[PDB]
Structure 1
Amino acid sequence: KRDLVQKLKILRQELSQQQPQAGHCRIEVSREEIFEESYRQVMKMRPKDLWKRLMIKFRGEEGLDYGGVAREWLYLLSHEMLNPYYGLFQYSRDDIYTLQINPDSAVNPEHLSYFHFVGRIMGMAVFHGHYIDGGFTLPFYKQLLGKSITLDDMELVDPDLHNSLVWILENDITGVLDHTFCVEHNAYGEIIQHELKPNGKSIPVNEENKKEYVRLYVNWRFLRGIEAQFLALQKGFNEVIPQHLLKTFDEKELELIICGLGKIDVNDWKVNTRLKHCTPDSNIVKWFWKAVEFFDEERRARLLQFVTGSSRVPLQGFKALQGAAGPRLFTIHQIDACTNNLPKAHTCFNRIDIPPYESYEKLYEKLLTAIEE
């Protein structure tokens, strides 16, 4: 994870060449309807338009500075669009941290147009150096790179199927298996017969069906139910960030440039934290970090998410932590409030407000109550 910086410098060099010298990508939207209004303006644009310098305005607002309005628009919109409320994404029943495409998104008939729009926004976020709070699986990113799903990819995705397919490959399954190139799935209460290739009444045999069976099955199973959604998303993304520019990246590296690091370094966090109304040596600050040191990786992910809106950190580390309009370091603000109160976050400012709790144990417990659930 060391030449990734150099890959990313090459990419952002080549993309700045992509930006036209003249013209702007103008957007004007209300804060209250940022998703729908951005959607309408952005989908009127040609891919060329999306590479232009951003010139953004919130309806009814003058705005301090264009650069700052633009960061804020990108931050807020990329935050909303990933919200299950809009119907495009959901968290896995299998894991409420993994983001996935909503397979029922078609209840909105224009759904594919919204997937295309989100793709474009993700592309513009990479183009302008912004990290989205992106919870997608690694095979999702490899699909974005134009790479085939592998049997290894099934370990997380479908762990029983993984075992089944590994067994098929590693053993002479002649006779026992008795399957064809037609796979069955229950969709919406109904059993669907899906042929993996023309005439899928070819029985699976050793005799070199089987390797092709597994490769077709695996690529079918990953995007199963979400093929059209994914395709539109990928198309929006690559209108902004052409696939040829990404040819030296693998899925792990793409994930890192899109949403940052999921491994939280507590030393980097500590060293890049600002203090308000509490000093480096005070109890509340000592106790906060003691709790963080005890917190496991899920608890740290929940804390980071609580305070900042995301559970991941910029590649550049905590010194690059993002507020709504530009860099804002993680901040602990000690407040004059009742000590029965929980910590309160302001995610726009990566700030946590902490009452003057009377012991570590009290701080520890109130902090856990705030971040679990």
Structure 2
Amino acid sequence: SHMDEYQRKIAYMYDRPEMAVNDAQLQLKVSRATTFEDAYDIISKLSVSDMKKKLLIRFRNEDGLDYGGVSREFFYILSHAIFNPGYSLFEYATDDNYGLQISPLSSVNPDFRSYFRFVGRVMGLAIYHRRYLDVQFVLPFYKRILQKPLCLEDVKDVDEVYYESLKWIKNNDVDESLCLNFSVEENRFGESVTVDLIPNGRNIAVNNQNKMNYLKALTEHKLVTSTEEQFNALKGGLNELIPDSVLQIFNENELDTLLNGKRDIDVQDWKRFTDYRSYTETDDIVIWFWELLSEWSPEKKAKLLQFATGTSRLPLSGFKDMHGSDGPRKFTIEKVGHISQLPKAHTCFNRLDIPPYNSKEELEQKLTIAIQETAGF
């Protein structure tokens, strides 16, 4: 199966003579509050020989056993700190479909190369020491790490509506009514500036003979050319530890599994950060629902999440910072409909309308039937 082949690849990769950890131990002390600052102070000065030794992480004034758990918690905190959009290093592809990608505005900093080399070193350290981050990038990011060609379909993972518009342009003919031409307007800190896809491109309208080149240039500029220097620095930092001959045995999904592990949806967070309309927290159609979500496989939970909210990807901080169509909108459970009808979903408001059933088995059957057409993960 897929899993067995992936395990064989992982064993072969970690059995390479160029990815063997040394016996000497390296200490690494970081305060819990200032994790980002201390992590950048220490990691951005370690040598490549030093980073290959055993990693032993001890939080300040928090002494205990099971250093493995401490290291895992440290990597979790660091991954949720550096990849946080509020730090202006990465950004969600869309606010209603949370997918991390390199932020074009990050070039405003005087020296983004040091920070992105630090990010690359962090990712290489996570892969090297069998520790998992918990961020979820977009597939084009992974396809860029492995140096794969990027085509139009890759825009589907980044932004759905943009891909639909591009496919519309590809299929249907374009007239002169549309004022489309080889130029992209980007609003950087209030002021909007024009970038020419081709030289003297702002004065060349797209006819039926140019729209293919226009789509190619738009896809390349949206996915690659906007983030050249930053991703070059990041990949240099990553390849400092992991040779490119090792990463190029995986694909855009096996690499994701290697970085972030087997993805799962937390249920405790889901229950703690949901709200009800006409339903109380003690209502039977709520306790049965939460029991069902407790004893379910991750694929079916992801399918239900995509069916209700609209996408299978969650924000970087769980369901707390969840966005709807217009703004923050937590997962809502509502009493709307007749007994016979299946549960319904309003995606633009993250609402799930569950009628007042009479038994847990009927609820399970209706909810499993209603989500079949939705494919998650």
SS of the aligned residue for 1:94 comes to coil
Shift of residue 46, structure 1, vs aligned partner: 3.1
Is the aligned partner of 1:193 residue 2:201? no
Query: Contact between 2:75 and 2:132, CA under 8 Å: does it hold in 1?
Result: no
Equivalent residue, structure 2, for 1:322: none
* Map 1:54-133 → 2, pairs under 5 A: 54-64=55-65, 66-95=67-96, 97-106=98-107, 108-133=109-134
Shift of residue 176, structure 1, vs aligned partner: 7.9
Q: Which moved more, 1:19-28 or 1:228-237?
A: 19-28
Residue deviations 1:57-77 (CA, integer Å, cap 9, x gap): 333455435545433432332
- CA pair 27-110 structure 1, distance change in 2 beyond 3 A: farther
- Aligned-residue Cα RMSD (Å) equals 4.3
Q: What is the rounded CA distance, in whole Å, between the counterparts of 1:87 and 1:202 in structure 2?
A: 33
SS of the aligned residue for 2:99 comes to strand
Equivalent residue, structure 2, for 1:245: 246
Q: What is the rounded CA distance, in whole Å, between the counterparts of 1:96 and 1:176 in structure 2?
A: 31
Residue deviations 1:285-344 (CA, integer Å, cap 9, x gap): 977423546972357999x989x9779xxxxxxxxxxxxxxxxxxxxxxxxxxxxxxxxx
Aligned equivalent of 2:13, options 7, 11, 14: 11
Query: Contact between 1:169 and 1:211, CA under 8 Å: does it hold in 2?
Result: yes
Name the amino acid aligned to 1:140: F
Name the amino acid aligned to 2:146: L
Shift of residue 194, structure 1, vs aligned partner: 2.4
Gaps of 5+ in 1: 267-283, 312-359, 361-373
Query: Contact between 2:99 and 2:137, CA under 8 Å: does it hold in 1?
Result: yes
Shift of residue 5, structure 1, vs aligned partner: 2.2
Aligned equivalent of 1:297, options 301, 305, 313: 305
Query: Contact between 2:184 and 2:197, CA under 8 Å: does it hold in 1?
Result: no
Q: What is the rounded CA distance, in whole Å, between the counterparts of 1:301 and 1:173 in structure 2?
A: 31
Query: Contact between 2:72 and 2:132, CA under 8 Å: does it hold in 1?
Result: no
Shift of residue 258, structure 1, vs aligned partner: 1.5
Name the amino acid aligned to 1:30: S
Equivalenced residues, count: 292
Query: Contact between 1:19 and 1:53, CA under 8 Å: does it hold in 2?
Result: no
Q: What is the rounded CA distance, in whole Å, between the counterparts of 1:106 and 1:146 in structure 2?
A: 22
- CA pair 115-164 structure 1, distance change in 2 beyond 3 A: same
Equivalent residue, structure 2, for 1:183: 183
Query: Contact between 1:88 and 1:102, CA under 8 Å: does it hold in 2?
Result: yes
- CA pair 174-103 structure 1, distance change in 2 beyond 3 A: closer
Equivalent residue, structure 1, for 2:330: none
What is the TM-score of this pair, normalised by structure 2? 0.62
Percent identical pairs in the alignment equals 37
Shift of residue 132, structure 1, vs aligned partner: 1.4
Query: Contact between 2:120 and 2:237, CA under 8 Å: does it hold in 1?
Result: yes
Equivalent residue, structure 1, for 2:50: 49
Query: Contact between 1:119 and 1:236, CA under 8 Å: does it hold in 2?
Result: yes
Q: What is the rounded CA distance, in whole Å, between the counterparts of 1:173 and 1:220 in structure 2?
A: 21
Gaps of 5+ in 2: 268-285, 320-359, 361-377
Residue deviations 1:254-303 (CA, integer Å, cap 9, x gap): 2222223446699xxxxxxxxxxxxxxxxx9977423546972357999x
What is the TM-score of this pair, normalised by structure 1? 0.62
Equivalent residue, structure 2, for 1:365: none
Shift of residue 92, structure 1, vs aligned partner: 4.6
* Map 1:104-253 → 2, pairs under 5 A: 104-106=105-107, 108-166=109-167, 169-170=170-171, 182-188=182-188, 189-197=190-198, 200=201, 211-223=212-224, 225-253=226-254
Shift of residue 248, structure 1, vs aligned partner: 2.7
Query: Contact between 2:140 and 2:157, CA under 8 Å: does it hold in 1?
Result: no
Query: Contact between 1:26 and 1:55, CA under 8 Å: does it hold in 2?
Result: yes
Shift of residue 4, structure 1, vs aligned partner: 2.1
SS of the aligned residue for 2:257 comes to helix
Shift of residue 108, structure 1, vs aligned partner: 4.3
Shift of residue 238, structure 1, vs aligned partner: 2.3
Query: Contact between 1:75 and 1:130, CA under 8 Å: does it hold in 2?
Result: no
Residue deviations 1:189-222 (CA, integer Å, cap 9, x gap): 4443323345658956776x66554333212112
Residue deviations 1:130-177 (CA, integer Å, cap 9, x gap): 221112111111112122321001224344543454455556769888
Shift of residue 251, structure 1, vs aligned partner: 1.2
Name the amino acid aligned to 1:105: S
- CA pair 39-168 structure 1, distance change in 2 beyond 3 A: same
SS of the aligned residue for 2:140 comes to helix
Residue deviations 1:236-263 (CA, integer Å, cap 9, x gap): 2222322221223221222222223446
Query: Contact between 2:169 and 2:211, CA under 8 Å: does it hold in 1?
Result: yes
